[PDB]
Amino acid sequence: AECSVDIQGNDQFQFNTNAITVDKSCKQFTVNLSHPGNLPKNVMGHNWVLSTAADMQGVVTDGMASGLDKDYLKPDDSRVIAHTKLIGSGEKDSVTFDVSKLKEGEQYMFFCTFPFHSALMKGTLTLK
Amino acid sequence: AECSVDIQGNDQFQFNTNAITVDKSCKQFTVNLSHPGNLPKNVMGHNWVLSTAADMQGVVTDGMASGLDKDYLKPDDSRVIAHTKLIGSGEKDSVTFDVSKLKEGEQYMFFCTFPFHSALMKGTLTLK
Amino acid sequence: AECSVDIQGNDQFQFNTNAITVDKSCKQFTVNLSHPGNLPKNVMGHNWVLSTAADMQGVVTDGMASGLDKDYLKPDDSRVIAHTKLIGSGEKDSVTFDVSKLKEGEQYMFFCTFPFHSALMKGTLTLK
Amino acid sequence: AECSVDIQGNDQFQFNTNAITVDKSCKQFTVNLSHPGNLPKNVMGHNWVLSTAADMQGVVTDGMASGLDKDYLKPDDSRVIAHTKLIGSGEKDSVTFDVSKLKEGEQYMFFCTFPFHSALMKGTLTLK
Ligand SMILES: [Cl-]
Ligand SMILES: [Cl-]
Ligand SMILES: [Cu+2]
Ligand SMILES: [Cu+2]
Ligand SMILES: [Cu+2]
Ligand SMILES: [Cu+2]
Ligand SMILES: [Cu+2]
Ligand SMILES: [Cu+2]
Ligand SMILES: [Cu+2]
Ligand SMILES: [Cu+2]
Numbered sequence: 001a002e003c004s005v006d007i008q009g010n011d012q013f014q015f016n017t018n019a020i021t022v023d024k025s026c027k028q029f030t031v032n033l034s035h036p037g038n039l040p041k042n043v044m045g046h047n048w049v050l051s052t053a054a055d056m057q058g059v060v061t062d063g064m065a066s067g068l069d070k071d072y073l074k075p076d077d078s079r080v081i082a083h084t085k086l087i088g089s090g091e092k093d094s095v096t097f098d099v100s101k102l103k104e105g106e107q108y109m110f111f112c113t114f115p116f117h118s119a120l121m122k123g124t125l126t127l128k
Numbered sequence: 129a130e131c132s133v134d135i136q137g138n139d140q141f142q143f144n145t146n147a148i149t150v151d152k153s154c155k156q157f158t159v160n161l162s163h164p165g166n167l168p169k170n171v172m173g174h175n176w177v178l179s180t181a182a183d184m185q186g187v188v189t190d191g192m193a194s195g196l197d198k199d200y201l202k203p204d205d206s207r208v209i210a211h212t213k214l215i216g217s218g219e220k221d222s223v224t225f226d227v228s229k230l231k232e233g234e235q236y237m238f239f240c241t242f243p244f245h246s247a248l249m250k251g252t253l254t255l256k
Numbered sequence: 257a258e259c260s261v262d263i264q265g266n267d268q269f270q271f272n273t274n275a276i277t278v279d280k281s282c283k284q285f286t287v288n289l290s291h292p293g294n295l296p297k298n299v300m301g302h303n304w305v306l307s308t309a310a311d312m313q314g315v316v317t318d319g320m321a322s323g324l325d326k327d328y329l330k331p332d333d334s335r336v337i338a339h340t341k342l343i344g345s346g347e348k349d350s351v352t353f354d355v356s357k358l359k360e361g362e363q364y365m366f367f368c369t370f371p372f373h374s375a376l377m378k379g380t381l382t383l384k
Numbered sequence: 385a386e387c388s389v390d391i392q393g394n395d396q397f398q399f400n401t402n403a404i405t406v407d408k409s410c411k412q413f414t415v416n417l418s419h420p421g422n423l424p425k426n427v428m429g430h431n432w433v434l435s436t437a438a439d440m441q442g443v444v445t446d447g448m449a450s451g452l453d454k455d456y457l458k459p460d461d462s463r464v465i466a467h468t469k470l471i472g473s474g475e476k477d478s479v480t481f482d483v484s485k486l487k488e489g490e491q492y493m494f495f496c497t498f499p500f501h502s503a504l505m506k507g508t509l510t511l512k
Pocket of ligand 3: 003
């Protein structure tokens with residue numbers, strides 16, 4: 001089974017998927033994020049951030065407040081299972097994480113923490 | 129706190145929200161669904177269906193198969209916590225359900241079961 | 257034929273339609289805009305603004321620069337055929353305009369001028 | 385200036401852009417379409433089709449009727465300025481066309497002609 005996904009965030013406040021499936025046979029999983037938009041990261045930056053559903057709101061809320069200089073993530077935030085850096089137009093970044101960090105019966109959300117984006121830039125991540 | 133939400137499904141494969149919050153002080157909760165599109169229910173029907181996240185895929189899969197005559201829900205499907213009827217252009221329908229049917233620590237999804245719509249017509253429902 | 261449309265802008269950077277049809281038999285046309293989101297107008301304000309397609313970019317660009325105090329429209333901007341005020345959570349506003357302001361063979365765009373929203377909050381308006 | 389764009393259509397009824405700009409200095413322009421979804425072309429096929437805004441509705445309407453076997457385009461449809469083939473999960477296709485086929489003062493639409501998709505799978509194409 002494939003153990004990676006390519007994700008884009010654009011100038012229209014959108015990721016190109018709202019649902020990621022990680023096959024239970026994967027040992028690692030890689031997200032390759034790119035920004036095919038034209039706007040710079042100070043006005044339209046995106047990241048890809050994974051947390052439990054229960055933790056999403058706190059990660060987004062604390063992240064928003066940290067500013068462009070912290071990639072809109074609270075420093076030393078243990079709620080963050082895995083994440084990319086914040087990118088703007090023409091940039092890309094990849095994150096690989098150990099699938100053993102995910103459990104069944106738990107449900108996960110991915111999202112961007114740039115101010116206000118998560119209302120549309122969010123989706124589910126699930127083992128199967 | 130408010131204990132109802134107005135939801136629309138349109139001709140563009142979209143609900144007008146992807147996240148519903150039910151205040152923990154509500155005893156009942158009402159969803160008022162409408163279809164401001166122009167297309168009829170045989171080609172662009174929508175419903176609003178609530179289940180646990182774990183049950184969503186089975187409800188959608190079994191529902192799809194039941195046809196326009198069953199409102200695209202498997203008969204006697206106990207996985208369905210609450211739902212509206214399937215509606216087309218110009219129609220509306222409301223459902224009220226007991227908030228005691230929802231628990232904390234559990235996470236819920238709403239979605240439309242008309243064939244293929246749930247890939248975009250879906251969102252989270254959470255107590256708070 | 258109907259000569260009005262109800263439009264919503266939400267917390268997810270979206271209008272609930274991307275295509276408005278004005279029947280050629282209408283003498284006036286009314287847009288009723290509402291904001292069913294929770295965010296205030298300083299962070300998630302929306303308006304509904306009509307212009308020719310050729311004029312859209314200049315209206316959006318000049319509008320962005322005018323600030324919350326000008327409802328993000330350049331004062332005395334003759335390019336604006338019709339528009340609502342800028343609204344935030346829980347507010348609504350209606351605009352009525354004369355259909356004789358529109359021509360056939362010309363093509364029109366509607367959009368929100370709040371900073372950056374028009375990349376997703378836009379659509380076509382056409383006589384038929 | 386760049387004279388190509390990469391476009392995706394997914395399982396969620398979406399292209400990853402709603403606005404294409406063709407630089408006036410381009411002599412040719414290339415669209416590279418891919419389908420990163422999982423669904424096959426009989427249920428979730430996509431193409432990329434360019435026409436004038438005035439011609440869009442007729443191309444979509446006549447195209448819909450032609451069936452999977454005709455890639456949902458009416459044979460010998462002179463309204464089609466350029467187009468890709470219809471693709472499903474895991475497929476890709478590119479089209480190159482002469483920029484001299486486009487004029488200023490005219491306004492263009494791109495869209496998918498698979499049944500009903502164009503309500504969301506559409507956008508503008510403009511010279512600049
Ligand atoms: Cl979701
Ligand atoms: Cl458009
Ligand atoms: Cu494998
Ligand atoms: Cu973002
Ligand atoms: Cu109350
Ligand atoms: Cu539906
Ligand atoms: Cu009338
Ligand atoms: Cu807006
Ligand atoms: Cu060049
Ligand atoms: Cu399509």
